[PDB]
């Protein structure tokens, strides 16, 4: 799921920059966003358990 | 299952085993004790469960020491055990220090002994309340009461048993701080008759004891003649 989502996020970042091609920096930012939000969800679940 | 031992607190911080012990004390017949200027007077509503019992059977007034009295309510067997403990404490004090135990000290020692039975699951709380009274020239009249939880306080007039609340209301009107033992004995008899319920219980016998200057500081049973006068006064008052 994370690998699928990072691709779409990189595409959207390329869209915002307004170019028809995805970039390595776009992929880096996409991973930084998706993995961080997944970690946020995990820690939220941990707090709910607490 | 938070009320099955005295070594567990309830969620709100209550020892239910101790509370149940007090509940047992609340089913006994009332017993009152009034402090006055001269000394202390005790009174007990002894119900006659059967006509086959001898007068004076199951006496609820004890002499823990030659100058200290004791009235009890609740489980009689536990009360007698505490009276033996009080006698032991009084006797040990005299042997070690060489003079009569002060009533305040005696109440403290017995209260701590009672309190030690509300901390472990290996024993159960005493299901009885009692009151200690004494008089000495140096210390004057003194009256104390101890509950199952092990709490001891000084009182001017105390009640324990079924009709505790009604007795407390009657005791409030006596103005005992400036009265003598001779007049208080009649008042103690009057209160017991009023609180008693003739409709529910069949009959009762009034037991009286006192300690003060008139007795020279020795707790003893009230004389038969005085008891007869007090009973007649109480009956006459109940017009």
């Amino acid at each position: 799921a994370e690998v699928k989502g990072v691709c779409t996020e990189a595409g959207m970042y390329a869209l915002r920059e307004r170019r028809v091609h995805v970039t390595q920096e776009d992929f880096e930012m996409a991973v930084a966003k998706v993995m961080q939000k997944d970690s946020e969800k995990n820690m939220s679940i941990k707090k709910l358990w607490k | 299952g938070y009320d099955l031992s005295a070594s567990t607190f309830s969620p709100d911080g209550r020892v239910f085993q101790v509370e149940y012990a007090m509940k047992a004390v609340e089913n006994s017949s009332t017993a009152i004790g009034i402090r006055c200027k001269d000394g202390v007077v005790f009174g007990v509503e002894k119900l006659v469960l059967s006509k086959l019992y001898e007068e004076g059977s199951n006496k609820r007034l004890f002499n823990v020491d030659r100058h200290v009295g004791m009235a009890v309510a609740g489980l009689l067997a536990d009360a007698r055990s505490l009276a033996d403990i009080a006698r032991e404490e009084a006797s040990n004090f005299r042997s070690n220090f060489g003079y009569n135990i002060p009533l305040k000290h005696l109440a403290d020692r017995v209260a701590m002994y009672v309190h030690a039975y509300t901390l472990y699951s290996a024993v159960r709380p005493f299901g009885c309340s009692f009151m200690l009274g004494s008089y000495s020239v140096n210390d004057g009249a003194q009256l104390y009461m101890i509950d199952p939880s092990g709490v001891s306080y000084g009182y001017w007039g105390c009640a324990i048993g079924k009709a505790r609340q009604a007795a407390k209301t009657e005791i409030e009107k006596l103005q005992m701080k400036e009265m003598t033992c001779r007049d208080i004995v009649k008042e103690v008899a009057k209160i017991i008759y009023i609180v008693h319920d003739e409709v529910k219980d069949k009959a009762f016998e009034l037991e009286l004891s006192w300690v003060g200057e008139l007795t020279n500081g020795r707790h003893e049973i009230v004389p038969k003649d005085i008891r007869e006068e007090a009973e007649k006064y109480a009956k006459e008052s109940l017009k």
């Binding site: - | 299952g1 070594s7 607190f9 911080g13 472990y120 306080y153 001017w156 409030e172």
Partner: protein
């Protein structure tokens, strides 16, 4: 959060989260009495003030007291279950006397609080007996440390303090005192009594009369623990 496994709620054994529910209930039992106490440390004095409720005229108010004299120079105030507090007071007196007999000098307040805390800690570890549901506050003058105020609780925690409360309104009193303590000194005079009485009067909204509170003090000039008489208490009350 509040998971249970076995008898963790019935004896002093760890809950799944690492909790001692029985200890927590002992804290909850301290509020059964319905009373509150306050202890404040001054520049050269220590003061303890607590409520005094006589439910009816029949009670002998003289015997109803929560202030006790552990030794000549140490006094304490207790809150919570009545019977439990008296038993702990007796133990403190014995421990203080034993210290004097063994080492040849009076027991420091911190050491006395430590000894009582150690005794309490045994109750929360062993499952045979429940923890005493009462709290103690000790005040005394140290030889080279000035006034001392200490408090020990059912668990065995015994931190020192500058101002403290205990009972039903411990939270409100703690906030009130912290605000006062923050401003300048939490009082720096023998009228530290006024700060305490005001703190107690503020939280409970009582407007005490002379026969509704008891005060005990120790001062550097007069280290002996004393219980102020109803007359002296009234004098402080009128002044404030």
């Amino acid at each position: 959060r509040g998971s249970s496994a076995g008898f963790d709620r019935h004896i002093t054994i760890f809950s799944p989260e690492g909790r001692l529910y029985q200890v927590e209930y002992a804290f909850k039992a301290i509020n059964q009495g319905g009373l509150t106490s306050v202890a404040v440390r001054g520049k050269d004095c220590a003061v303890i003030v607590t409520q005094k409720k006589v439910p009816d005229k029949l009670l002998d108010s003289s015997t109803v007291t929560h202030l006790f004299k552990i030794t000549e120079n140490i006094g304490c105030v207790m809150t919570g279950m009545t019977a439990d507090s008296r038993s702990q007071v007796q133990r403190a007196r014995y421990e203080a006397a034993n210290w004097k007999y063994k080492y040849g000098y009076e027991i420091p307040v911190d050491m006395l609080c430590k000894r009582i805390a150690d005794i309490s800690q045994v109750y929360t570890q062993n499952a045979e007996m429940r923890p005493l549901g009462c709290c103690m506050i000790l005040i005394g003058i140290d030889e080279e440390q000035g006034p001392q105020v200490y408090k020990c609780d059912p668990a065995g925690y015994y931190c020192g303090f500058k101002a403290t409360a205990a009972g039903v309104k411990q939270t409100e009193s703690t906030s009130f005192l912290e605000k006062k303590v923050k401003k300048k000194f939490d009082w720096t005079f023998e009228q530290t009594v006024e700060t305490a009485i005001t703190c107690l009067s503020t939280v409970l909204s009582i407007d005490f009369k002379p026969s509704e509170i008891e005060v005990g003090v120790v001062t550097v000039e007069n280290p002996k623990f004393r219980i102020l008489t109803e007359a002296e208490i009234d004098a402080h009350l009128v002044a404030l």
